[PDB]
Amino acid sequence: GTVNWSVEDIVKGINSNNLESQLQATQAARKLLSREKQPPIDNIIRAGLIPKFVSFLGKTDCSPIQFESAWALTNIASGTSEQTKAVVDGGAIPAFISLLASPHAHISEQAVWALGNIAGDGSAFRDLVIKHGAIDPLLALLAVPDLSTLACGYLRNLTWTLSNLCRNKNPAPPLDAVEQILPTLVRLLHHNDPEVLADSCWAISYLTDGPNERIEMVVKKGVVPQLVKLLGATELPIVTPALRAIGNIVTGTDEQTQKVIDAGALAVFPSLLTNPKTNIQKEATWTMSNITAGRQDQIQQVVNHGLVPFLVGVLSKADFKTQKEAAWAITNYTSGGTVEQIVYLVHCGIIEPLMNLLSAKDTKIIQVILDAISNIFQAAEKLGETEKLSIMIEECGGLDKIEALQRHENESVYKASLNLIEKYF
Amino acid sequence: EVKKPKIDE
Protein backbone atom coordinates (compact mmCIF):
# COMPACT_ATOMS: atom_id res chain seq x y z
CA GLY A 1 0.00 0.00 0.00
CA THR A 2 2.79 2.48 0.89
CA VAL A 3 5.23 1.62 -1.93
CA ASN A 4 6.26 4.18 -4.52
CA TRP A 5 3.70 6.90 -3.67
CA SER A 6 3.95 10.29 -5.31
CA VAL A 7 4.90 13.29 -3.19
CA GLU A 8 1.53 14.75 -4.06
CA ASP A 9 -0.21 11.66 -2.58
CA ILE A 10 1.99 11.82 0.52
CA VAL A 11 1.00 15.41 0.99
CA LYS A 12 -2.72 14.70 0.58
CA GLY A 13 -2.60 11.99 3.26
CA ILE A 14 -0.52 14.04 5.66
CA ASN A 15 -2.90 16.97 5.31
CA SER A 16 -6.00 14.73 5.80
CA ASN A 17 -7.65 15.09 9.18
CA ASN A 18 -7.14 11.37 9.78
CA LEU A 19 -4.26 10.10 11.87
CA GLU A 20 -4.33 6.69 10.22
CA SER A 21 -4.28 8.32 6.77
CA GLN A 22 -1.41 10.50 8.04
CA LEU A 23 0.39 7.43 9.33
CA GLN A 24 0.15 5.66 5.99
CA ALA A 25 1.38 8.70 4.10
CA THR A 26 4.28 9.14 6.58
CA GLN A 27 5.30 5.55 6.01
CA ALA A 28 5.04 6.10 2.26
CA ALA A 29 7.42 9.08 2.71
CA ARG A 30 9.80 6.93 4.80
CA LYS A 31 9.91 4.36 2.00
CA LEU A 32 10.64 7.06 -0.63
CA LEU A 33 13.38 8.47 1.63
CA SER A 34 14.81 4.98 2.31
CA ARG A 35 15.49 4.17 -1.36
CA GLU A 36 19.21 4.14 -2.23
CA LYS A 37 18.62 5.61 -5.69
CA GLN A 38 18.35 9.39 -5.47
CA PRO A 39 15.92 9.66 -2.48
CA PRO A 40 13.72 12.73 -3.15
CA ILE A 41 14.80 14.72 -0.10
CA ASP A 42 14.44 18.18 -1.68
CA ASN A 43 10.97 17.39 -3.05
CA ILE A 44 9.84 16.27 0.43
CA ILE A 45 11.30 19.43 1.96
CA ARG A 46 9.77 21.63 -0.75
CA ALA A 47 6.38 19.96 -0.13
CA GLY A 48 6.56 21.48 3.35
CA LEU A 49 6.48 18.07 5.15
CA ILE A 50 9.18 18.59 7.81
CA PRO A 51 6.93 20.53 10.25
CA LYS A 52 4.29 17.78 10.03
CA PHE A 53 6.89 15.05 10.65
CA VAL A 54 8.18 16.99 13.63
CA SER A 55 4.62 17.30 15.07
CA PHE A 56 4.19 13.55 14.61
CA LEU A 57 7.27 12.91 16.77
CA GLY A 58 5.13 14.16 19.70
CA LYS A 59 2.20 11.74 19.19
CA THR A 60 2.75 9.49 22.22
CA ASP A 61 -0.61 7.78 21.49
CA CYS A 62 0.47 6.80 18.00
CA SER A 63 3.88 5.17 18.41
CA PRO A 64 3.96 3.96 14.75
CA ILE A 65 3.70 7.54 13.41
CA GLN A 66 6.44 8.59 15.84
CA PHE A 67 8.69 5.88 14.39
CA GLU A 68 7.88 6.53 10.73
CA SER A 69 8.33 10.32 11.16
CA ALA A 70 11.59 9.74 13.07
CA TRP A 71 12.91 7.52 10.32
CA ALA A 72 11.86 9.95 7.58
CA LEU A 73 13.51 12.86 9.40
CA THR A 74 16.59 10.73 10.06
CA ASN A 75 17.02 10.30 6.30
CA ILE A 76 16.46 13.97 5.50
CA ALA A 77 19.04 14.82 8.23
CA SER A 78 21.47 12.37 6.60
CA GLY A 79 21.78 14.59 3.48
CA THR A 80 23.50 17.92 2.82
CA SER A 81 24.00 20.62 5.46
CA GLU A 82 21.05 22.48 3.99
CA GLN A 83 18.87 19.35 4.33
CA THR A 84 20.06 18.79 7.91
CA LYS A 85 19.30 22.44 8.62
CA ALA A 86 15.72 22.07 7.37
CA VAL A 87 15.24 19.33 9.98
CA VAL A 88 16.77 21.40 12.74
CA ASP A 89 14.79 24.48 11.64
CA GLY A 90 11.55 22.47 12.02
CA GLY A 91 12.30 22.07 15.77
CA ALA A 92 13.39 18.44 15.49
CA ILE A 93 16.21 18.56 18.08
CA PRO A 94 14.08 18.87 21.29
CA ALA A 95 11.49 16.51 19.86
CA PHE A 96 14.13 13.80 19.23
CA ILE A 97 15.66 14.32 22.67
CA SER A 98 12.18 13.74 24.14
CA LEU A 99 12.01 10.47 22.26
CA LEU A 100 15.23 9.18 23.78
CA ALA A 101 13.10 8.19 26.81
CA SER A 102 10.51 6.38 24.71
CA PRO A 103 9.46 2.94 26.13
CA HIS A 104 9.71 1.66 22.57
CA ALA A 105 13.30 0.74 21.89
CA HIS A 106 12.98 1.05 18.09
CA ILE A 107 11.82 4.68 18.54
CA SER A 108 14.55 5.63 21.06
CA GLU A 109 17.08 4.12 18.68
CA GLN A 110 15.65 6.13 15.75
CA ALA A 111 15.98 9.32 17.77
CA VAL A 112 19.58 8.38 18.64
CA TRP A 113 20.27 7.95 14.91
CA ALA A 114 18.62 11.23 13.93
CA LEU A 115 20.58 13.17 16.57
CA GLY A 116 23.81 11.51 15.31
CA ASN A 117 23.10 12.85 11.81
CA ILE A 118 22.34 16.31 13.18
CA ALA A 119 25.42 16.42 15.40
CA GLY A 120 27.50 14.94 12.55
CA ASP A 121 26.81 17.96 10.35
CA GLY A 122 29.35 20.16 12.13
CA SER A 123 30.40 21.95 15.33
CA ALA A 124 27.45 24.30 15.47
CA PHE A 125 24.71 21.63 15.28
CA ARG A 126 26.82 19.34 17.52
CA ASP A 127 26.89 22.10 20.13
CA LEU A 128 23.20 22.88 19.66
CA VAL A 129 22.33 19.22 20.25
CA ILE A 130 24.40 19.42 23.43
CA LYS A 131 22.73 22.67 24.57
CA HIS A 132 19.30 21.07 24.17
CA GLY A 133 20.40 18.47 26.74
CA ALA A 134 21.04 15.39 24.59
CA ILE A 135 23.98 13.96 26.51
CA ASP A 136 22.26 12.98 29.81
CA PRO A 137 19.49 10.91 28.15
CA LEU A 138 21.97 9.35 25.69
CA LEU A 139 24.26 8.26 28.47
CA ALA A 140 21.32 6.99 30.53
CA LEU A 141 20.60 4.50 27.73
CA LEU A 142 24.05 2.94 28.28
CA ALA A 143 23.83 2.97 32.12
CA VAL A 144 23.48 -0.82 32.35
CA PRO A 145 25.65 -3.32 34.31
CA ASP A 146 26.66 -5.11 31.14
CA LEU A 147 26.62 -3.60 27.62
CA SER A 148 26.22 -7.15 26.20
CA THR A 149 22.54 -7.14 27.23
CA LEU A 150 21.76 -4.29 24.77
CA ALA A 151 20.73 -5.10 21.21
CA CYS A 152 23.77 -4.88 18.95
CA GLY A 153 22.29 -2.42 16.45
CA TYR A 154 21.10 -0.10 19.22
CA LEU A 155 24.52 -0.11 20.96
CA ARG A 156 26.29 0.54 17.66
CA ASN A 157 23.98 3.48 16.95
CA LEU A 158 24.51 4.93 20.41
CA THR A 159 28.29 4.58 20.04
CA TRP A 160 28.20 6.25 16.61
CA THR A 161 26.06 9.16 17.83
CA LEU A 162 28.33 9.71 20.84
CA SER A 163 31.30 9.70 18.47
CA ASN A 164 29.66 12.50 16.46
CA LEU A 165 29.22 14.54 19.68
CA CYS A 166 32.99 14.18 20.16
CA ARG A 167 33.74 15.13 16.56
CA ASN A 168 34.89 18.36 14.84
CA LYS A 169 37.00 21.36 15.77
CA ASN A 170 36.88 25.13 15.53
CA PRO A 171 35.65 24.72 18.09
CA ALA A 172 36.16 21.40 19.75
CA PRO A 173 33.25 20.09 21.85
CA PRO A 174 32.57 21.79 25.22
CA LEU A 175 35.08 20.64 27.85
CA ASP A 176 32.29 19.72 30.27
CA ALA A 177 30.48 17.64 27.57
CA VAL A 178 33.73 15.77 26.91
CA GLU A 179 34.23 15.10 30.64
CA GLN A 180 30.65 13.86 30.87
CA ILE A 181 30.99 11.52 27.86
CA LEU A 182 34.50 10.10 28.47
CA PRO A 183 33.65 7.52 31.22
CA THR A 184 31.04 5.91 28.92
CA LEU A 185 33.45 6.01 26.03
CA VAL A 186 36.11 4.25 28.14
CA ARG A 187 33.58 1.48 28.81
CA LEU A 188 32.63 1.16 25.14
CA LEU A 189 36.32 0.91 24.21
CA HIS A 190 36.36 -2.33 26.28
CA HIS A 191 33.28 -3.78 24.54
CA ASN A 192 33.79 -6.83 22.30
CA ASP A 193 31.86 -5.69 19.16
CA PRO A 194 34.18 -4.63 16.31
CA GLU A 195 31.90 -1.78 15.16
CA VAL A 196 31.53 -0.38 18.72
CA LEU A 197 35.32 -0.58 19.09
CA ALA A 198 35.85 1.17 15.77
CA ASP A 199 33.52 4.03 16.60
CA SER A 200 34.84 4.27 20.18
CA CYS A 201 38.36 4.66 18.75
CA TRP A 202 37.16 7.31 16.29
CA ALA A 203 35.63 9.25 19.22
CA ILE A 204 38.95 9.03 21.11
CA SER A 205 40.83 10.05 17.95
CA TYR A 206 38.69 13.15 17.72
CA LEU A 207 39.11 14.00 21.41
CA THR A 208 42.90 13.67 21.14
CA ASP A 209 43.08 15.78 17.99
CA GLY A 210 43.75 19.09 19.73
CA PRO A 211 45.98 20.89 22.29
CA ASN A 212 47.87 19.03 25.02
CA GLU A 213 45.13 19.76 27.55
CA ARG A 214 42.56 17.87 25.44
CA ILE A 215 44.97 14.91 25.05
CA GLU A 216 45.52 14.93 28.77
CA MET A 217 41.82 14.62 29.55
CA VAL A 218 41.84 11.32 27.59
CA VAL A 219 45.24 10.00 28.67
CA LYS A 220 44.33 10.65 32.33
CA LYS A 221 41.43 8.15 31.93
CA GLY A 222 43.95 5.33 31.42
CA VAL A 223 42.84 4.37 27.87
CA VAL A 224 46.33 4.28 26.28
CA PRO A 225 46.92 0.51 27.07
CA GLN A 226 43.53 -0.36 25.56
CA LEU A 227 44.35 1.73 22.49
CA VAL A 228 47.69 -0.08 22.06
CA LYS A 229 45.82 -3.36 22.30
CA LEU A 230 43.39 -2.25 19.58
CA LEU A 231 46.41 -1.14 17.52
CA GLY A 232 47.14 -4.88 17.17
CA ALA A 233 43.60 -5.87 16.15
CA THR A 234 43.03 -7.85 12.96
CA GLU A 235 40.18 -5.57 11.82
CA LEU A 236 41.46 -2.62 9.81
CA PRO A 237 38.39 -0.46 10.76
CA ILE A 238 39.71 -0.72 14.33
CA VAL A 239 43.42 -0.31 13.59
CA THR A 240 42.83 2.85 11.57
CA PRO A 241 41.21 4.96 14.36
CA ALA A 242 43.33 3.37 17.11
CA LEU A 243 46.49 4.39 15.25
CA ARG A 244 45.09 7.91 14.57
CA ALA A 245 44.41 8.22 18.34
CA ILE A 246 47.91 7.02 19.25
CA GLY A 247 49.37 9.36 16.63
CA ASN A 248 47.45 12.30 18.05
CA ILE A 249 48.61 11.46 21.57
CA VAL A 250 52.31 11.50 20.64
CA THR A 251 51.86 15.03 19.27
CA GLY A 252 51.42 16.06 22.94
CA THR A 253 54.08 16.30 25.64
CA ASP A 254 57.10 14.03 26.01
CA GLU A 255 55.30 12.67 29.10
CA GLN A 256 52.12 11.88 27.12
CA THR A 257 54.36 10.20 24.50
CA GLN A 258 55.99 8.09 27.22
CA LYS A 259 52.60 6.62 28.21
CA VAL A 260 52.24 5.29 24.64
CA ILE A 261 55.75 3.79 24.81
CA ASP A 262 55.25 2.38 28.32
CA ALA A 263 52.00 0.78 27.13
CA GLY A 264 53.94 -1.31 24.60
CA ALA A 265 53.13 0.56 21.38
CA LEU A 266 56.56 0.30 19.82
CA ALA A 267 56.30 -3.52 19.57
CA VAL A 268 53.47 -3.12 17.01
CA PHE A 269 55.41 -0.86 14.65
CA PRO A 270 57.30 -3.64 12.75
CA SER A 271 53.85 -4.69 11.41
CA LEU A 272 52.40 -1.16 11.06
CA LEU A 273 55.42 0.11 9.18
CA THR A 274 55.14 -2.81 6.75
CA ASN A 275 51.36 -2.81 6.64
CA PRO A 276 49.92 -3.42 3.17
CA LYS A 277 47.39 -0.59 3.59
CA THR A 278 49.22 2.60 2.43
CA ASN A 279 47.33 4.78 4.92
CA ILE A 280 48.34 2.62 7.93
CA GLN A 281 51.99 2.80 6.85
CA LYS A 282 51.75 6.55 6.37
CA GLU A 283 50.10 7.18 9.76
CA ALA A 284 52.44 4.76 11.51
CA THR A 285 55.40 6.64 10.04
CA TRP A 286 53.90 10.02 11.04
CA THR A 287 53.50 8.59 14.56
CA MET A 288 57.19 7.56 14.53
CA SER A 289 58.20 11.06 13.40
CA ASN A 290 56.55 12.48 16.53
CA ILE A 291 58.22 9.89 18.74
CA THR A 292 61.66 10.66 17.26
CA ALA A 293 60.97 14.36 18.00
CA GLY A 294 61.08 13.38 21.70
CA ARG A 295 63.80 12.87 24.29
CA GLN A 296 67.02 10.93 23.71
CA ASP A 297 65.76 8.19 26.05
CA GLN A 298 62.63 7.86 23.83
CA ILE A 299 64.80 7.77 20.72
CA GLN A 300 66.69 4.96 22.48
CA GLN A 301 63.49 2.94 22.90
CA VAL A 302 62.90 3.34 19.16
CA VAL A 303 66.42 1.96 18.65
CA ASN A 304 65.91 -0.86 21.16
CA HIS A 305 62.62 -1.99 19.56
CA GLY A 306 64.53 -2.43 16.28
CA LEU A 307 62.58 0.31 14.48
CA VAL A 308 65.43 2.14 12.76
CA PRO A 309 65.76 -0.58 10.04
CA PHE A 310 62.02 -0.28 9.52
CA LEU A 311 62.43 3.49 8.97
CA VAL A 312 65.25 2.78 6.49
CA GLY A 313 62.77 0.38 4.84
CA VAL A 314 60.01 3.03 4.43
CA LEU A 315 62.54 5.60 3.25
CA SER A 316 63.81 3.08 0.71
CA LYS A 317 60.45 2.03 -0.65
CA ALA A 318 56.95 3.24 0.10
CA ASP A 319 54.23 5.54 -1.18
CA PHE A 320 55.78 9.04 -1.57
CA LYS A 321 53.64 10.49 1.23
CA THR A 322 54.93 7.77 3.59
CA GLN A 323 58.51 8.43 2.44
CA LYS A 324 58.04 12.12 3.29
CA GLU A 325 56.88 11.16 6.83
CA ALA A 326 59.96 8.93 7.09
CA ALA A 327 62.19 11.84 6.07
CA TRP A 328 60.61 13.86 8.88
CA ALA A 329 61.14 10.99 11.31
CA ILE A 330 64.87 10.97 10.40
CA THR A 331 65.36 14.76 10.61
CA ASN A 332 63.70 14.70 14.01
CA TYR A 333 65.83 11.75 15.16
CA THR A 334 69.01 13.48 13.94
CA SER A 335 68.09 16.85 15.53
CA GLY A 336 67.39 15.34 18.97
CA GLY A 337 69.62 12.29 19.08
CA THR A 338 73.00 11.65 20.72
CA VAL A 339 76.08 11.09 18.55
CA GLU A 340 75.94 7.31 19.11
CA GLN A 341 72.23 7.24 18.06
CA ILE A 342 73.07 9.15 14.89
CA VAL A 343 76.02 6.86 14.13
CA TYR A 344 73.66 3.87 14.50
CA LEU A 345 71.35 5.35 11.89
CA VAL A 346 74.15 5.53 9.36
CA HIS A 347 75.15 1.94 10.23
CA CYS A 348 71.52 0.87 9.51
CA GLY A 349 71.91 2.27 6.00
CA ILE A 350 70.01 5.58 6.11
CA ILE A 351 72.34 7.46 3.72
CA GLU A 352 71.65 5.82 0.38
CA PRO A 353 67.81 5.96 0.62
CA LEU A 354 67.97 9.57 1.94
CA MET A 355 70.13 10.53 -1.04
CA ASN A 356 67.76 8.80 -3.50
CA LEU A 357 64.94 11.01 -2.19
CA LEU A 358 66.87 14.19 -3.04
CA SER A 359 65.64 13.73 -6.60
CA ALA A 360 62.03 14.26 -5.49
CA LYS A 361 60.08 17.22 -6.90
CA ASP A 362 58.99 18.28 -3.41
CA THR A 363 60.77 21.31 -1.97
CA LYS A 364 59.78 20.56 1.59
CA ILE A 365 61.17 17.00 1.54
CA ILE A 366 64.45 18.28 0.06
CA GLN A 367 64.78 20.78 2.90
CA VAL A 368 64.05 17.99 5.41
CA ILE A 369 66.69 15.66 3.97
CA LEU A 370 69.28 18.48 3.73
CA ASP A 371 68.63 19.28 7.38
CA ALA A 372 69.12 15.63 8.28
CA ILE A 373 72.45 15.46 6.37
CA SER A 374 73.66 18.55 8.23
CA ASN A 375 72.82 16.95 11.56
CA ILE A 376 74.55 13.72 10.59
CA PHE A 377 77.68 15.63 9.45
CA GLN A 378 77.61 17.51 12.74
CA ALA A 379 77.68 14.23 14.67
CA ALA A 380 80.52 13.01 12.45
CA GLU A 381 82.46 16.27 13.06
CA LYS A 382 82.42 15.47 16.78
CA LEU A 383 83.88 12.04 15.95
CA GLY A 384 86.35 13.25 13.28
CA GLU A 385 84.65 11.15 10.61
CA THR A 386 83.37 13.83 8.26
CA GLU A 387 85.39 12.30 5.36
CA LYS A 388 83.97 8.77 5.84
CA LEU A 389 80.50 10.27 5.45
CA SER A 390 81.48 12.48 2.50
CA ILE A 391 82.80 9.40 0.73
CA MET A 392 79.64 7.38 1.48
CA ILE A 393 77.48 10.18 0.13
CA GLU A 394 79.70 10.46 -2.95
CA GLU A 395 79.72 6.71 -3.66
CA CYS A 396 75.93 6.38 -3.64
CA GLY A 397 75.49 9.34 -6.02
CA GLY A 398 74.57 11.81 -3.27
CA LEU A 399 77.17 14.46 -4.07
CA ASP A 400 75.83 14.71 -7.64
CA LYS A 401 72.37 15.45 -6.26
CA ILE A 402 73.53 18.02 -3.68
CA GLU A 403 75.53 19.85 -6.41
CA ALA A 404 72.39 20.15 -8.59
CA LEU A 405 70.48 21.56 -5.59
CA GLN A 406 72.86 24.55 -5.45
CA ARG A 407 71.10 25.38 -8.76
CA HIS A 408 67.61 24.89 -7.24
CA GLU A 409 64.91 27.59 -7.16
CA ASN A 410 64.23 27.53 -3.40
CA GLU A 411 66.53 29.82 -1.41
CA SER A 412 66.94 27.46 1.60
CA VAL A 413 67.65 24.53 -0.71
CA TYR A 414 70.41 26.22 -2.73
CA LYS A 415 71.92 27.70 0.44
CA ALA A 416 71.92 24.50 2.57
CA SER A 417 73.28 22.56 -0.42
CA LEU A 418 76.03 25.15 -1.07
CA ASN A 419 76.99 25.08 2.63
CA LEU A 420 77.31 21.26 2.56
CA ILE A 421 79.49 21.32 -0.59
CA GLU A 422 81.55 24.21 0.78
CA LYS A 423 81.88 22.64 4.21
CA TYR A 424 82.37 18.93 3.45
CA PHE A 425 82.99 18.49 -0.29
CA GLU B 1 30.72 7.91 7.98
CA VAL B 2 29.64 11.15 9.57
CA LYS B 3 26.00 10.97 8.40
CA LYS B 4 24.08 7.85 7.43
CA PRO B 5 20.60 7.10 6.08
CA LYS B 6 18.55 4.21 7.38
CA ILE B 7 17.84 1.94 4.42
CA ASP B 8 16.02 -1.01 6.06
CA GLU B 9 14.27 -2.54 9.11
Numbering used by the authors:
A (entry chain A): 72 to 496
B (entry chain C): 1 to 9
Show passages lifted from the paper:
To validate the computational modeling design, the analogs were co‐crystallized with importin‐α, and their structures were experimentally determined by X‐ray crystallography. The crystal structures of A1–A4 in complex with mImpα2 at resolutions ranging from 2.11 to 2.42 Å were determined. The electron densities of the 10 ARM domains of mImpα2 without the importin‐β‐binding (IBB)‐domain were clearly resolved including the P1–P6 and P′1–P′5 sites for the major and minor NLS‐binding grooves, respectively. The crystal structures had the same space groups as the original TAF8 NLS/importin‐α complex and every amino acid was resolved for all analogs bound at the major groove. Accordingly, the analogs bury an average surface area of 629.6 ± 21.2 Å2 in the major groove. Superpositioning the four analog structures at the major groove showed that the sequences also share almost identical binding modes, based on the alpha‐carbon's (Cα's) as the crystal structure of TAF8 NLS. The Cα backbone of the analogs exhibited RMSD values of 0.485, 0.529, 0.487, and 0.513 Å for A1, A2, A3, and A4, respectively, at the major groove. The analogs formed a total of 8–10 hydrogen bonds, 1 salt bridge, 37–40 VdW interactions, and 1–2 cation–π bonds. Visual inspection revealed that although the side chains for K299, K300, and K301 residues aligned at the P2, P3, and P4 sites, indicating that the analogs also relied on the consensus sequences for their binding, there were notable spatial orientational differences for some other residues and the amino acid contributions for A1–A4 changed significantly from the computational modeling. Crystal structures of these analogs complexed with mImpα2 confirmed their binding modes, albeit the novel interactions formed in the modeling procedure were disrupted by DTT used during crystallization.
Importin‐α is critical for successful nuclear import as it recognizes and binds to cargo proteins bearing a classical nuclear localization signal (NLS), which facilitates their transport from the cytoplasm into the nucleus. Importin‐α possesses an α‐solenoid tertiary structure characterized by a deep concave surface ideal for NLS‐cargo binding (Fournier et al. 2013). Notably, the twist causes the concave surface to become deeper at the N‐ and C‐termini, resulting in what is commonly known as the major (ARMs 2–4) and minor (ARMs 6–8) NLS‐binding grooves, respectively. In this study, we describe a combined computational and biophysical approach to design TAF8 NLS analogs, with zero net charge, and test their ability to target importin‐α.
